[PDB]
Amino acid sequence: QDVVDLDFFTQEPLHLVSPSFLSVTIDANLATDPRFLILLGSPKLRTLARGLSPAYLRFGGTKTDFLIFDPKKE
Amino acid sequence: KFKNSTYSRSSVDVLYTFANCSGLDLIFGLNALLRTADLQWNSSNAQLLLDYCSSKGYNISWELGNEPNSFLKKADIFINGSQLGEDFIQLHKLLRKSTFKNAKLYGPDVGQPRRKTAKMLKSFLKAGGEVIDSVTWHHYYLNGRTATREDFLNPDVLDIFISSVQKVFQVVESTRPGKKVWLGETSSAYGGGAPLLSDTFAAGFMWLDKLGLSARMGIEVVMRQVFFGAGNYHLVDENFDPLPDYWLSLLFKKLVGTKVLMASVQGSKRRKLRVYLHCTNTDNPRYKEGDLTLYAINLHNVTKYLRLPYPFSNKQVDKYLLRPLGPHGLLSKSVQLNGLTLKMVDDQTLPPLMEKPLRPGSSLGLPAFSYSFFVIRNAKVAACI
Ligand SMILES: *[C@@H]1[C@H](O)[C@@H](O)[C@H](O[C@H]2O[C@H](CO)[C@@H](O)[C@H](O)[C@H]2NC(C)=O)[C@@H](C(=O)O)[C@H]1O
Ligand SMILES: *[C@@H]1O[C@H](CO[C@@H]2O[C@@H](C)[C@@H](O)[C@@H](O)[C@@H]2O)[C@@H](O)[C@H](O)[C@H]1NC(C)=O
Ligand SMILES: *[C@@H]1O[C@H](CO)[C@@H](O)[C@H](O)[C@H]1NC(C)=O
Ligand SMILES: *[C@@H]1O[C@H](CO)[C@@H](O)[C@H](O)[C@H]1NC(C)=O
Ligand SMILES: *[C@@H]1O[C@H](CO)[C@@H](O)[C@H](O)[C@H]1NC(C)=O
Ligand SMILES: [Cl-]
């Protein structure tokens, strides 16, 4: 009758994940968008980001290996 | 195809401010294709960045390279795992001499473990494994160009992830036993996602199953590609509006604890009804020490009714059932929690995620092509402290 019985193992934790287990990325590509400052300055986007704290934010992507830091650029 | 670009102090500040103001821990990927005469990593550009970040008192973690397995394709440069390991040792020495000498270092951000990628990861961990804090690798189920709706609902596609995970742990157990293993970049489909699929309710089967299996199999951290950006696997669209996977991600974070347990369905057929069990998140103000969080995926085309085992059969259960808002069904970009559409209250305010208490002793209803969380109140599981 579409009824299903579950078995649970509850003796001990099998693993411990990070409190940051569910983390996110921002692609390296986004830093090549002329609007990078406007986008990451968005209050609405920051509210949604705070919702996922605690988390890691990985800044990385294919473009990681094609980006050069220029300390003289404005 | 890929050309060098520069970024500014301004760009670094934008990124850091966004992480800091959002309560996120920034990990910054350094360019590994900056190479000396004899293909050693040239750390001179990274030095300029570490110095700048040090001067601004930025608390940042580091990576070096992205998918070094595909450098030959992307840049007609081959770096072997042994050399990359040496490059990571060189970065570890720079970090140790910087203001944040205890900064963390992750890598090598390899793709999923095909023969050549497994070889690179093994030689990398032999050479450089001592200086990384976690091993990072990447996974996608599908090519976004060719992915179908049926693929997003196919338990045979979901199950392929289990073999990828087993293959990565075989390499790590052979080289750096007990080193933490992270998914450093992961999604439904690569090449920016599957149009009309990666940004829908249908994407949630893959995402929730990946989280469940990652936690069950020993992965400590899963990094979702992408929070926001060019690719319809984003959690947040171009209008800064949350997609169904954002809401699923937020519910997961509210209900699921750090201590991983195990659930399974009695009977041979275990493909289409997928079940996961953790301690309940202790930070959730509704629940108490000992409570359980079950989450389940139903890929059957009929409702299933789940029965909890002794001694949990008569406990008060809170249901958190996600279903799409019509008319586009699983291809909807809107989701309801227990029949209420999830939407921002305003640009500053997330909505409450309201439980549906079930009749104590009732079976847990899971509609066709849906996913749900169930919190078992007063479970009093000692393992959950
Ligand atoms: C993992 C890569 O690190 C990541 O950068 C890829 O996504 C970006 O690059 C691809 C092409 O390499 C583009 O199709 C995506 O639109 C990019 N995404 C964003 C968010 O800018 C990613 C992927 O293939 O989707 C992985 O290769
Ligand atoms: C529904 O799915 C069928 C295969 O699934 C099995 O049968 C259904 C009724 C449920 O009992 C499920 O739990 C079983 O595993 C298909 O044979 C059938 O074609 C499907 N119907 C449609 C409309 O796609
Ligand atoms: C990127 O820069 C390096 C050194 O700064 C250079 O040798 C290389 O050719 C550049 N690559 C591309 C693809 O433009
Ligand atoms: C590393 O790169 C810098 C700047 O591109 C260059 O001037 C320096 O001499 C390079 N070092 C080696 C050893 O090639
Ligand atoms: C790895 O690469 C370097 C060249 O950068 C080479 O000297 C070394 O022999 C290579 N290692 C193996 C195992 O081939
Ligand atoms: Cl190699």
Residue numbers in the entry:
A (entry chain B): 36 to 109
B (entry chain A): 159 to 543
Text lifted from the article:
Heparanase (HPSE) is a mammalian endo-β-D-glucuronidase (hereafter, endo-β-glucuronidase) that plays a key role in HS polysaccharide degradation. Humans express two distinct and unrelated β-glucuronidases: endo-β-glucuronidase HPSE falls under the GH79 family of the sequence-based Carbohydrate Active enZymes (CAZy) classification, while exo-β-glucuronidase GUSB is a CAZy GH2 family enzyme involved in lysosomal mucopolysaccharide breakdown. Enzymatic attack by glycosidases upon the electrophilic epoxide “warhead” of cyclophellitol-derived molecules leads to alkylation of a catalytically essential nucleophile residue, resulting in covalent and irreversible inhibition. Herein, we present HS-configured pseudodisaccharides, featuring a cyclitol epoxide designed to bind selectively to the HPSE active site and react with its essential catalytic nucleophile residue.
Native HS-like α-1,4-GlcNAc and α-1,4-GlcNAc-6′-O-sulfate were appended to the NRE of 1 to create pseudodisaccharides 2 and 3, respectively. We further analyzed the molecular basis of interaction between our inhibitors and their targets by X-ray crystallography, using ligand soaking to derivatize enzymes in crystallo. 2, 3, and 4 were all observed to specifically occupy the HPSE active site cleft, with covalent linkages between their pseudoanomeric (C1) carbons and the enzyme nucleophile Glu343. Noncovalent interactions for 2–4 within the HPSE cleft were generally similar to those previously characterized for HS substrates, albeit with a ∼17° rotation around C1′ for the NRE deoxy-sugar of 4 (compared to 2), owing to its lack of 2′ substituent. Using cABPP, pseudomonosaccharide 1 proved to be an ineffective HPSE inhibitor up to 10 μM, while 2, 3, and 4 all displayed nanomolar HPSE inhibition potencies. Platelet lysates contain complex mixtures of overlapping enzyme activities, including both the endo- and exo-β-glucuronidases HPSE and GUSB, respectively; thus, they provide a challenging environment in which to examine specificity. cABPP of platelet lysates showed highly selective inhibition of human platelet HPSE by both 2 and 3 (IC50s = ∼0.53 μM and ∼0.06 μM, respectively), while 1 exclusively inhibited GUSB (IC50 = ∼0.75 μM). Clear inhibition of HPSE-mediated fondaparinux cleavage was effected by both 2 (IC50 = ∼0.46 μM) and 3 (IC50 = ∼0.51 μM), which were both approximately twofold more potent than reference small-molecule HPSE inhibitors #98 (10; IC50 = ∼0.80 μM) and OGT2115 (24) (11; IC50 = ∼0.95 μM). H35SPG digests by U87 glioma cell lysates produced similar H35S solubilization profiles whether inhibitor 2 was applied before or after lysis, indicating that this molecule can also penetrate cells to inhibit the intracellular HPSE pool. After 14 d, a marked reduction in lung growths was observed for mice treated with 2 compared to a phosphate buffered saline (PBS)-only control group.
